[PDB]
């Protein structure tokens, strides 16, 4: 009913950290690939800075959300620097967000990946649920990729905290992702992120493909209320498609809790082929952000 929360805000000194080259701009703004060295720490961290005017009250509230976890599968803030513009510092993901990577290799994802990142999404989601976080934007282009065994939850642009159902009056929202309770009613739960999590897997199933292609987002409240959902993806398994329906349920209590995903899905991990069917199933200091750690 209080909890205080005590994590620490790192200011990191511009100095400390070597930009190397641009990311790429869209959506918010500059993302940057770099290394970081702590001063006299004899460590070289491979490290990502976001940046883009009083939008600093949106990217702080950003910060304040990624300092405080400290999970396996999501992204957590190394720091900030207060430089002439606002800077967000995180740990670099090499392979990229994991929407982009299955479309990229298409051909050579087996069922076993694609099953595990299923169960690592639904462990860090499970734990945002520990933390009472509703991340009210998960979808596959949201996932980073630290290597092809790992991936993490990241962007907590819209993350709301909950206390012992947010109730948004922002701008643009992703319809095509969102519950139809969030939809109608602007009520956001931690059921409302299984929906979220259901059309995440639908995303990563049919390889990288666009939820309702071709279709308004001002037609997808008519669509769902008529009992319409995304399609079974071909190489999935009446049973991994009854999970991804099943957190399309208009009783948000039915879409299974974040918890019993990682259950269903790590038992089809050890089998997976029985339930998806595909077609041929000075770099001398450099520490990763994960073996770093300080008190
Ligand atoms: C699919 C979009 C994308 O992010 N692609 C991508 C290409 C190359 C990369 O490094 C080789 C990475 N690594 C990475 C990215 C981010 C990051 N991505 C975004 C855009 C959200 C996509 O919808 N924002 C960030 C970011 C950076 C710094 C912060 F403090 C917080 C968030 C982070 C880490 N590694 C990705």
Known sequence: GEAPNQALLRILKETEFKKIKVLGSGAFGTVYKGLWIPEGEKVKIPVAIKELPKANKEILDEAYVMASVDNPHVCRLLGICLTSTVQLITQL????????????????????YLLNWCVQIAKGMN????????????????????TPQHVKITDFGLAKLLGAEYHAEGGKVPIKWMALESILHRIYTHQSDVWSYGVTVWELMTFGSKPYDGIPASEISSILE??????????????????????????????????????????????????????????????????????
């Open 93 to 112: 993901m090499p392979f990229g967000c994991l929407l982009d990577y299955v479309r990229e290799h298409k051909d050579n994802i087996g069922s076993q």
């Open 127 to 146: 734990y945002l649920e520990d933390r009472r976080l509703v991340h009210r934007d998960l979808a596959a282009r949201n996932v980073l990729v630290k």
């Open 226 to 295: 008529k009992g319409e959902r995304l399609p079974q993806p071909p190489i999935c398994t009446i049973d991994v498609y009854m999970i991804m329906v099943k957190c399309w349920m208009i009783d948000a209590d039915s879409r299974p809790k974040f918890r019993e995903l990682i259950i269903e899905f790590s038992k089809m991990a050890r089998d997976p082929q029985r339930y998806l069917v595909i077609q041929g199933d000075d770099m001398d200091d450099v520490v990763d952000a994960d073996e770093y750690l300080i008190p």
